[PDB]
Amino acid sequence: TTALVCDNGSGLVKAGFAGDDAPRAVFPSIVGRPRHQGVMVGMGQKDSYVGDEAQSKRGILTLKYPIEHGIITNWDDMEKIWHHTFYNELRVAPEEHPTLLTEAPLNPKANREKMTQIMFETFNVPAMYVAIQAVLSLYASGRTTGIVLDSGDGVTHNVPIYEGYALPHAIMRLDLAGRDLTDYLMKILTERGYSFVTTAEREIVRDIKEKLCYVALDFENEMATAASSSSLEKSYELPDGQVITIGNERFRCPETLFQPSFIGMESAGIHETTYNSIMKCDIDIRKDLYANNVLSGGTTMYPGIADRMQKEITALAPSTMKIKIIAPPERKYSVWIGGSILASLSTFQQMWISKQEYDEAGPSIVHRKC
Amino acid sequence: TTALVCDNGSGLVKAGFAGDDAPRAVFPSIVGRPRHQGVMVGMGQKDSYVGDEAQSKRGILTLKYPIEHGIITNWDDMEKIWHHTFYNELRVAPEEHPTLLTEAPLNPKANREKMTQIMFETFNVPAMYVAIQAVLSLYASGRTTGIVLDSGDGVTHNVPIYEGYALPHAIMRLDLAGRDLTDYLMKILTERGYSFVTTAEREIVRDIKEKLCYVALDFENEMATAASSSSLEKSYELPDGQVITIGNERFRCPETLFQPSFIGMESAGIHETTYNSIMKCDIDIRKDLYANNVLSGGTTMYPGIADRMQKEITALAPSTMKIKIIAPPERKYSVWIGGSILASLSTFQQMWISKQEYDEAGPSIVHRKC
Amino acid sequence: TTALVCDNGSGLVKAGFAGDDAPRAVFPSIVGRPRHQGVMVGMGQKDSYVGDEAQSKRGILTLKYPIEHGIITNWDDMEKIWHHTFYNELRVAPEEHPTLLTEAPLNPKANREKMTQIMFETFNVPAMYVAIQAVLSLYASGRTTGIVLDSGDGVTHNVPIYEGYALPHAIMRLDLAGRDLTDYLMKILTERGYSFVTTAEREIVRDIKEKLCYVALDFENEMATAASSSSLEKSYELPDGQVITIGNERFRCPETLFQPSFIGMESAGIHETTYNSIMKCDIDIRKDLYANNVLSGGTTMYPGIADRMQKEITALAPSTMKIKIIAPPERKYSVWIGGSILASLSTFQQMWISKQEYDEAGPSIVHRKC
Amino acid sequence: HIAEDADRKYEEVARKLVIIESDLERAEERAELSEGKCAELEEELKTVTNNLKSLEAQA
């Protein structure tokens, strides 16, 4: 029997069947509730909308993400999202399918305990399993060695692997991702006059970010160039007409990944935490880590991010190593692709957590063994 | 030579000389133009009236504020108001006094650039400077640490400051203030029969708001009490006789500050944005922020707003912190008082933007360095 | 003329006068610099704060230790810390006092060369001397024979002494100490939901470590006991409220000293390196070494560390020897106490490195004779 | 308003005070009994050490 792969993420649910090339259902991980009165008697108003139905009706709803920084902070909303994913998007019965969920590294244990308890009780999956996103990304990249930099909507983390062995003491987790860049852009757009305060307006700004922002190779002279001429200015049209034009914001928004002090954080840029995670590894494997930086996730999709990353790491590493940033063109779904590959392996069918093991050991089995 | 302090605000100009205890000129920031015909030949009708001269000829004029939400949206009217402020209220020559202007945080750059250009070109000030209203409010409160909540006529904002260091990533700006409460009161008074639609009637309703409205410590049982008895009803006499009596409107008008959903806004109340701004600061300074909530501006002058604010923040914060709301009895002029203190400091006389620096750098001098 | 004792260490400066019973000044060896903006004109902004002044303002500063693993890796910051120690804490003139610095064994020569050059040039001490921490700890213990395990903030080392003769081929130096335990605890607390990433939060976690952590006599059954009941859970209150409760982390943190594989190190626990350093000595003195294990430094202050140490060494050594772990109650200042005793000896006054010897021989005089 | 506020708050303060006091005296009982227990363990250990050294001399 086929299995389900349900990479959750903090901004997008990507589900599908183990053995496909791409996720079958990709929709926002969002729950909307009506905000206004409701006067038309007989309209049949729902209590809440999920997925991308809540996205087209977003004008009258208040949107909430049930996952903040990789952690599930609203379990009823997460249950709604899973119910939707199973019954309306994939149109299956969860009782007939093992499910491979995914989770960021180095986040609380109650998260996985609640995941597995929810699955086994309110969905009656025959078996399940909770992988780590970076490992699956490496599976999808077709490698067994490399330091993968995953950057989605909630959390950015490095995991260095060698020959299929993880270095759990060198795993570095950072908490600025797509959503903090969206908020920084919402804050930077006000200095031109545009004011986005609603959650629907946050979605609008997210789309502006996904369409017009890029990473400058050299930040300072890019700033000076944008100051001198006006060739960097593009235009965007809100969904009511009323075009807006942005200039240096285009590269000031994603630059925060390399100077997290823009949003008042004390951490270092992603280049520097990658270098530190490498320099925390055994001196023999780091020459092979330098040449297998695997970029993953949506927040790594800016134009020019691989070149800036390579420039920075080359400036940090010794002048003899060969820095290679590996950025596939489909790197936004690498975690799901690797998850499907993993759940399709024959030697994996003993790694599931069967219903009987859960019935014997309680929800605590998820990390105690698997 | 003495300097001028010209806290503009969106509802009231407060000007004076640096070194005084209180502003010398306080008049409405308003420009009126006649609507009707004009039949008496030789009456000598002016083209437009500004300040409180437009407030006495209110009945025949149409009033307009050149500042909407902290942003100057009519630069000719703002030029008129500044010309008035200098030549008729203060009765000075702007060519012989540096000028300290004030502005809310997180508003467009063109606002400051135009302020600077106007001052230097069409008033020939020797120097100028554009402070932030919250910093000056803290100066006037006599402390170097605290989260100040300024709420004037156009905009409400929090600025957390510690030991003289601002936390610009935790500044939160909200766009409901005195004027939105005035409009909500104009709309809520129609359910008793009173209909104010004119701009003059908007001024009347503003006076009603300043004289009869208060914040209820507990909104629900206050509502039930007003429903039960009639001990909350007061009476007001319009300027033609015609007494009006209002009941629960008295506390339903300023309640919007704590439930901005009454006017269809999605934001949170001022208590909740204050708490969020605090919880966005470093864990070591927020205990000292919890005990120095400084209130400022006119919209914080309702009877019982400090008690409700303290109750709400106490309900939100941990049960060990000491929540202290600092509400001086003169907090309506805190920005001007702090501005005079600042402009009087000896160590400040190098922070001015001299005319020569402007002539070198252009209007962009203002935010680029000062 | 009296002399100064300046046990530097990598986490705490302990200074005083030769002849006292305890260090006169004990403050963190830390230098903080402001990261945020600074708005209040005239607040008197300092460029950098040192010592425990940087500890109270740590909410707005970024803290840095100029000593990483016993090695001074920032000589400007170390010069700042020494200047502070002499002028603000001890309030003396370094030109009138010989200074006894201290260093860990088996660290680069340039460290001592730069120490003595700094002293003689930018402080003009009349003479100086650089001792070894373990020897001074043995002085303070009142012995001439024993294997001393010193464990501070940066480095752990054993030095076996017999009849006042060191065995330099049996000195073993290990590079996990208090700071690596603090980092491991910061990483282990994330699996309960608490997230400390800032340097100030690292100080908070250090205090949690110093208040709630202990060494379990038997790690496995202690683990099972913590899993069974909940009697091991204590609660801590962060400096903003927000009570946190930790369970088996209390003894999982210092257990790393006995299983350095928890932080991904390949070495052996402190018990095993102690036993190895003993078994590297001549077969006649090791019976007297077995009974004079002298613990020293702050990291040896966990409750129950002496008993675990004795149990482990007893299980390793032959079943006839008498293992005695000597753990004084003031063992956190043994190095300074012994240094004061040493600098007070009359026969020591010929071992100083006079200014004239340095002027003749260059900085290389320090290790070349003394 | 503020008076009844502070009154209810600090009556609850006296509530948690009574609770924390109960826990205090319970911890005092715990402390005294634990002193007695470690004292019994102290006589245990003194006796067993006397036995050990005597019988080891014998051996």
Ligand SMILES: Nc1ncnc2c1ncn2[C@@H]1O[C@H](COP(=O)(O)OP(=O)(O)O)[C@@H](O)[C@H]1O
């Ligand atoms: N083309 C793009 N350019 C820049 N950023 C993007 C792009 N596409 C998506 N993003 C960012 O990626 C985030 C979603 O990435 P994703 O990997 O799906 O997150 P998650 O793994 O948490 O579901 C969004 O917040 C968005 O800001």
Ligand SMILES: Nc1ncnc2c1ncn2[C@@H]1O[C@H](COP(=O)(O)OP(=O)(O)O)[C@@H](O)[C@H]1O
């Ligand atoms: N005593 C009062 N009670 C309630 N509201 C007041 C009072 N005095 C002034 N206001 C409100 O404050 C606003 C003006 O406040 P002010 O601080 O001068 O704003 P600004 O600084 O933007 O000019 C007016 O809109 C008015 O509604």
Ligand SMILES: Nc1ncnc2c1ncn2[C@@H]1O[C@H](COP(=O)(O)OP(=O)(O)O)[C@@H](O)[C@H]1O
């Ligand atoms: N009571 C305690 N319990 C556990 N650890 C402690 C205690 N006191 C100090 N430490 C640890 O000891 C370190 C400081 O010890 P110290 O001997 O001063 O080091 P150094 O000699 O390098 O300055 C700190 O990192 C702290 O984690």
